[PDB]
Amino acid sequence: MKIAIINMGNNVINFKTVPSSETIYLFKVISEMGLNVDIISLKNGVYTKSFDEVDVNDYDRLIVVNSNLAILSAQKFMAKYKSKIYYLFTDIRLPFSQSEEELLIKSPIKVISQGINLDIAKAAHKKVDNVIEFEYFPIEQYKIHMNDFQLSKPTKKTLDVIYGGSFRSGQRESKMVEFLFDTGLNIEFFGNAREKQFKNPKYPWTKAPVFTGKIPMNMVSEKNSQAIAALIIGDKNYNDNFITLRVWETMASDAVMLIDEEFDTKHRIINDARFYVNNRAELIDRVNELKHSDVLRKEMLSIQHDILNKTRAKKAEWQDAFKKAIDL
Numbered sequence: 519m520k521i522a523i524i525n526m527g528n529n530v531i532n533f534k535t536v537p538s539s540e541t542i543y544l545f546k547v548i549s550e551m552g553l554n555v556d557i558i559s560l561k562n563g564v565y566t567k568s569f570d571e572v573d574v575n576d577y578d579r580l581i582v583v584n585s586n587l588a589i590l591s592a593q594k595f596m597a598k599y600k601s602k603i604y605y606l607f608t609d610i611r612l613p614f615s616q617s618e619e620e621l622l623i624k625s626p627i628k629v630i631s632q633g634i635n636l637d638i639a640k641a642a643h644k645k646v647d648n649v650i651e652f653e654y655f656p657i658e659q660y661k662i663h664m665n666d667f668q669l670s671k672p673t674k675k676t677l678d679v680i681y682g683g684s685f686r687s688g689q690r691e692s693k694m695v696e697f698l699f700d701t702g703l704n705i706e707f708f709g710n711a712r713e714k715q716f717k718n719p720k721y722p723w724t725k726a727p728v729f730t731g732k733i734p735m736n737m738v739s740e741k742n743s744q745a746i747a748a749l750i751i752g753d754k755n756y757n758d759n760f761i762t763l764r765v766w767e768t769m770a771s772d773a774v775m776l777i778d779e780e781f782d783t784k785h786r787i788i789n790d791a792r793f794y795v796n797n798r799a800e801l802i803d804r805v806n807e808l809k810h811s812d813v814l815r816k817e818m819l820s821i822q823h824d825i826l827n828k829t830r831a832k833k834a835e836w837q838d839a840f841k842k843a844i845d846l
């Protein structure tokens with residue numbers, strides 16, 4: 519059984535970019551499952567093999583992630599594969615889609631949805647003509663199942679709330695402004711967003727949080743740990759659907775995880791109302807409570823790390839479910 523992983527939109531080579539990084543981490547966790555795996559990209563290197571140095575049909579399973587030569591190359595390569603393509607649907611904005619006959623992909627496609635609501639995964643892929651089947655699998659838990667995963671230790675607090683990410687093309691501007699702007703709290707927004715991007719008239723604000731630059735994927739939980747709390751919000755279609763990597767990066771940190779009620783109305787992540795907030799007012803009160811009650815803050819951290827540990831204790835079941843999802 520030989521498996522190959524391709525990144526459809528970006529060149530994979532190092533841990534410089536987030537797309538290249540998450541691809542090497544998937545590869546790492548899949549390898550640690552005891553599977554013979556290769557990443558195919560533009561160049562041969564210490565992590566990758568080039569498209570021209572391999573025969574697409576030597577692989578029994580072809581896994582595709584998404585995050586231009588890399589695109590053209592991947593399409594051309596996939597177009598020659600004679601079996602089913604397993605697409606990891608990790609971002610609602612990145613469903614599978616085709617880029618004339620040398621690029622036309624005719625193979626059936628299995629979309630492994632990170633979101634539990636398969637109707638949303640279907641609607642996003644409605645323009646796909648290929649035979650396509652859907653299945654849910656919590657792909658994002660790959661970070662916590664990695665062999666060298668370590669929980670973040672107690673850190674000195676220099677911030678109240680923190681959030682790391684990008685602007686997502688304004689996909690969640692409403693929520694960012696509601697919870698991170700004009701709170702009168704000491705907030706930091708790290709990543710690719712910039713204050714200037716928040717120009718939508720529908721969401722007025724007076725004072726913005728502090729925008730700092732992006733950090734490596736492997737530094738996120740350590741960065742989150744500088745604050746009392748770290749916020750979990752999502753796009754509209756993530757609500758009650760996707761559990762994102764930020765949930766685990768936050769849960770593993772020394773920052774108490776505060777979740778937008780709308781993101782998880784059933785309280786699937788943690789069945790404890792103290793971790794959820796409905797609006798800006800509740801976020802403020804909740805952070806003030808945490809700042810002034812160490813017993814509370816420490817109790818909540820202990821509860822979230824516990825949940826994290828119980829999930830990590832089901833690694834074998836997670837690995838099996840992954841193998842089954844790729845027809846093994």
Ligand SMILES: O=c1ccn([C@@H]2O[C@H](COP(=O)(O)OP(=O)(O)O)[C@@H](O)[C@H]2O)c(=O)[nH]1
Binds near residue numbers: 536685686764
């Ligand atoms: O400077 C940063 C900020 C974010 N991230 C990664 O980007 C993810 C968030 O991506 P996004 O902004 O697209 O939002 P999401 O849909 O995941 O909540 C984080 O969880 C991190 O893993 C990172 O590596 N460095």
